[PDB]
Amino acid sequence: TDRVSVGNLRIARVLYDFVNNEALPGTDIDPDSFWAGVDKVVADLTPQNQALLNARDELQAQIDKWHRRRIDMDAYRQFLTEIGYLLPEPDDFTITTSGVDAEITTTAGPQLVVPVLNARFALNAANARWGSLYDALYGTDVIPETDGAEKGPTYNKVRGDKVIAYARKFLDDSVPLSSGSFGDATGFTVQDGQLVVALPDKSTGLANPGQFAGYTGAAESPTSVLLINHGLHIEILIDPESQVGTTDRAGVKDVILESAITTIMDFEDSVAAVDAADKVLGYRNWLGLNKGDLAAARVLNRDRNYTAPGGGQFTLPGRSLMFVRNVGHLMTNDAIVDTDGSEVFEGIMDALFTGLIAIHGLKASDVNGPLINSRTGSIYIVKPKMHGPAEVAFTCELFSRVEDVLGLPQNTMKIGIMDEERRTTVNLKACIKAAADRVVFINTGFLDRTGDEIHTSMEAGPMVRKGTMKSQPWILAYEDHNVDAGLAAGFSGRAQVGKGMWTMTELMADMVETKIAQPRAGASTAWVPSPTAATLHALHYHQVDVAAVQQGLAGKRRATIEQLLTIPLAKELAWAPDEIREEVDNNCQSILGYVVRWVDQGVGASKVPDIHDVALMEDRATLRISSQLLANWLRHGVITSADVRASLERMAPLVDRQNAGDVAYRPMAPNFDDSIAFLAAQELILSGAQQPNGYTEPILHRRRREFKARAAE
Ligand SMILES: O=C(O)C1=C/C(=C2\C=Nc3ccccc32)NN1
Numbered sequence: 069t070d071r072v073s074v075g076n077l078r079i080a081r082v083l084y085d086f087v088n089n090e091a092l093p094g095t096d097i098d099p100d101s102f103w104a105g106v107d108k109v110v111a112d113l114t115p116q117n118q119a120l121l122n123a124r125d126e127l128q129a130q131i132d133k134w135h136r137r138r139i140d141m142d143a144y145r146q147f148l149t150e151i152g153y154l155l156p157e158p159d160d161f162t163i164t165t166s167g168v169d170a171e172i173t174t175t176a177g178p179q180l181v182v183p184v185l186n187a188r189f190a191l192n193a194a195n196a197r198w199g200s201l202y203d204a205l206y207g208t209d210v211i212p213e214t215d216g217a218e219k220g221p222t223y224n225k226v227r228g229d230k231v232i233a234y235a236r237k238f239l240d241d242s243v244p245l246s247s248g249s250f251g252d253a254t255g256f257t258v259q260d261g262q263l264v265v266a267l268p269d270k271s272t273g274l275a276n277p278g279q280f281a282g283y284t285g286a287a288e289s290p291t292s293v294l295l296i297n298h299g300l301h302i303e304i305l306i307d308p309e310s311q312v313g314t315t316d317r318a319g320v321k322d323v324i325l326e327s328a329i330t331t332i333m334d335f336e337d338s339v340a341a342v343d344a345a346d347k348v349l350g351y352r353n354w355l356g357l358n359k360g361d362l363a364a365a366r367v368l369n370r371d372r373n374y375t376a377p378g379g380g381q382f383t384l385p386g387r388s389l390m391f392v393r394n395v396g397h398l399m400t401n402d403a404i405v406d407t408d409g410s411e412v413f414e415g416i417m418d419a420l421f422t423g424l425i426a427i428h429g430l431k432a433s434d435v436n437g438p439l440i441n442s443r444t445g446s447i448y449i450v451k452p453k454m455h456g457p458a459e460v461a462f463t464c465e466l467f468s469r470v471e472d473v474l475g476l477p478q479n480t481m482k483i484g485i486m487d488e489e490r491r492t493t494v495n496l497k498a499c500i501k502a503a504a505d506r507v508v509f510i511n512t513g514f515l516d517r518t519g520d521e522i523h524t525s526m527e528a529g530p531m532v533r534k535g536t537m538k539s540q541p542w543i544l545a546y547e548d549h550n551v552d553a554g555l556a557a558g559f560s561g562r563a564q565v566g567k568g569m570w571t572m573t574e575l576m577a578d579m580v581e582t583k584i585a586q587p588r589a590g591a592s593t594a595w596v597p598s599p600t601a602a603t604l605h606a607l608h609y610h611q612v613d614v615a616a617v618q619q620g621l622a623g624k625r626r627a628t629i630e631q632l633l634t635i636p637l638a639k640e641l642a643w644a645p646d647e648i649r650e651e652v653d654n655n656c657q658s659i660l661g662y663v664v665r666w667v668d669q670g671v672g673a674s675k676v677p678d679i680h681d682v683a684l685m686e687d688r689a690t691l692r693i694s695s696q697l698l699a700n701w702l703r704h705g706v707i708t709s710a711d712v713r714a715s716l717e718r719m720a721p722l723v724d725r726q727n728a729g730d731v732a733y734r735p736m737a738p739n740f741d742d743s744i745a746f747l748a749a750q751e752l753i754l755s756g757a758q759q760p761n762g763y764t765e766p767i768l769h770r771r772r773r774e775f776k777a778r779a780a781e
């Protein structure tokens with residue numbers, strides 16, 4: 069209820085007040101003009117937005133019928149071409165985007181993704197540009213807790229020594245000495261622009277003196293030594309009076325790594341935001357981060373100060389350069405409605421509002437606030453779930469029109485193309501071309517892209533199990549195809565090529581062991597769930613020369629269209645009944661475990677124990693893959709209707725028990741039919757086949773609004 073009328077728009081009062089009183093001031097944009105701009109952009113671009121969404125449904129309908137009238141890959145591919153799903157590949161080109169920050173064009177390193185509605189997590193992320201290696205090693209299972217090195221209420225010095233040793237070895241691998249090991253260092257000095265390291269006998273310098281990047285304190289006895297490797301900084305904090313430094317052979321207190329080079333503040337799959345009040349909380353946090361005054365009861369960090377090897381001062385950034393992830397093209401939100409009572413497209417709103425807010429981040433002031441995000445004056449929006457190059461061109465048009473409403477130079481709002489839909493994958497080169505002057509980023513993932521995969525080929529037959537999907541031909545070609553297209557479009561030295569998220573937040577040893585594969589595959593960046601994970605993952609960019617990898621990959625075409633189009637159908641008699649049961653339970657607990665927190669508590673990302681009590685931090689896309697898989701098995705009679713109900717009922721109390729220790733929690737068992745969460749989870753499965761491209765948000769947003777409305781009394 070209660071709205072402000074502006075032309076054809078009926079704007080929720082809370083939103084209206086927030087923009088005028090909080091967002092607009094300092095931007096020198098006339099409030100009346102802004103709202104007219106909103107009304108106009110919305111009226112003009114809404115039909116297009118709708119036209120694209122209808123085109124998806126049409127395409128999917130044809131693909132459905134085709135499968136029902138049957139596999140001949142040659143005919144399939146020709147069909148996709150005929151219906152305008154597979155478009156012709158454009159001639160080679162190089163992107164032209166300008167005014168892009170160094171964090172994106174040149175530096176390879178970790179990238180954090182955080183739900184914007186959580187100010188605490190958002191604050192930590194922005195400050196995770198720099199992280200303590202010691203804390204990360206000590207706090208996680210990277211250092212085993214075995215030989216007397218278990219963690220306790222108090223500091224364990226045996227475990228500390230292992231941390232130190234691990235770090236000492238890292239230094240050896242990253243910034244090697246001409247002779248000897250950092251392990252035996254006793255002191256650090258700066259003699260004539262050159263870092264001397266004191267060993268017991270002799271005293272050496274860096275193998276490459278070029279890696280010596282600066283220091284703090286007196287050259288004769290620095291308080292820290294700054295190093296650089298593969299563009300990433302390493303700070304050795306020296307302090308013999310500290311407890312840790314006291315026992316260190318060279319007085320070293322800590323090793324600090326440049327960690328999360330960039331961060332994505334997320335308005336999409338990691339948050340639950342189903343109405344106007346929610347969007348405002350989200351927008352307000354975004355405002356604070358760009359104002360640079362967001363804080364919790366604690367602040368955002370300022371740049372760091374150093375001394376060049378041969379005297380003189382310099383400075384380095386102290387915050388993670390921020391992107392924002394807008395919602396995609398599909399959903400509407402009641403934050404604004406029309407005179408007929410039709411909700412306005414949420415993506416259109418996000419562009420306008422997140423873009424307005426981001427103006428503050430281009431300026432250091434007192435009306436705009438103290439801390440600056442982008443130094444070149446770009447706004448970095450990541451756009452999810454686009455299908456095909458027309459939808460990309462549409463996003464760029466939206467951005468262009470928003471830039472006019474905001475009075476920003478054209479091409480200010482950069483785009484990060486997420487490759488997570490089949491129709492974007494197979495037309496990827498064309499998608500990048502459609503954004504050739506705005507694009508700063510492409511990336512791959514597992515959850516959404518597989519959900520689309522399952523849904524697109526829904527009628528073709530039963531898919532393989534979810535675990536199996538990570539090793540299927542289509543996804544391996546997809547991963548490699550992404551890297552190839554970016555590099556072919558000239559991304560190396562111009563834009564990020566990213567890869568997916570490590571979801572197992574407690575298995576850091578495993579992450580350190582395996583996630584190295586991503587930069588080895590030429591990814592200039594990849595997702596981590598926490599600041600701690602960003603610090604650990606930063607080790608990989610030290611061990612791997614991403615720029616060299618990309619250069620060596622140049623011109624290769626490692627994935628074919630046939631490979632991309634290889635549908636992940638299961639072979640005959642693939643599974644025993646126990647395996648089927650295990651897969652169903654797996655997916656049902658996955659849905660119930662994530663849905664219960666989303667619907668009941670408005671939580672979009674958290675450590676959710678899986679069926680075997682492994683902690684996984686996933687976003688909403690987990691629902692899409694899980695629900696589509698079950699819907700597929702349901703459709704082709706792998707499982708009956710009884711089967712699915714029995715599983716949800718078995719898994720509900722287990723999820724109930726898994727949330728013990730949360731006072732806010734309300735059990736779903738034993739009264740399932742009275743549980744809005746249980747029903748939401750059941751619906752996502754039973755109606756899964758009929759949701760557009762398998763998306764979960766229509767069901768979810770509806771059930772969360774229903775829960776919130778039941779809670780209104
Ligand atoms: O595999 C994918 O497609 C995918 C995983 C994922 C996340 C996993 N944990 C998260 C926490 C916060 C925001 C996003 C995520 N996003 N996309």
Ligand SMILES: [Mg+2]
Binds near residue numbers: 337452488513516689
């Ligand atoms: Mg996604």
